[PDB]
Amino acid sequence: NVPATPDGVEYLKNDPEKLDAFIMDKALLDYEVSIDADCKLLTVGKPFAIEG
Amino acid sequence: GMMGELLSGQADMIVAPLTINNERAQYIEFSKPFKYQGLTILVKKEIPRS
Ligand SMILES: N#Cc1cc2[nH]c(=O)c(=O)[nH]c2cc1[N+](=O)[O-]
Numbered sequence: 242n243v244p245a246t247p248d249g250v251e252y253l254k255n256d257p258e259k260l261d262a263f264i265m266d267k268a269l270l271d272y273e274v275s276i277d278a279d280c281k282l283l284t285v286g287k288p289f290a291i292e293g
Numbered sequence: 294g295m296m297g298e299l300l301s302g303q304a305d306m307i308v309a310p311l312t313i314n315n316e317r318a319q320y321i322e323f324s325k326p327f328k329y330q331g332l333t334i335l336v337k338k339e340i341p342r343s
Pocket residue numbers: 310311312313
């Protein structure tokens with residue numbers, strides 16, 4: 242687990258160690274990649290399990 | 294067609310794709326959508342080798 246989404250990204254950001262993958266709404270995990278010039282992160286795969 | 298038959302009076306549940314719409318949501322009543330549709334594109338095979 243991770244106690245918080247910013248904590249999650251930072252915890253992944255200890256490159257390359259620790260985590261290698263993550264799961265969360267695809268409306269925070271797109272903002273969280275839409276501020277980095279180096280664009281070290283990216284979104285892949287097929288969405289599933291809709292939610293409003 | 295299908296919508297017309299519904300609004301006639303002798304049908305009750307249009308179990309089919311229905312591509313919900315702004316204005317189409319007055320003379321009928323919808324529910325929570327259960328898939329996502331959008332107009333996409335395909336192109337001919339463009340995967341050769343080197
Ligand atoms: N599948 C499908 C499909 C579903 C549709 N559903 C609609 O409600 C409509 O107006 N046009 C449609 C057209 C298609 N179509 O032929 O691609």
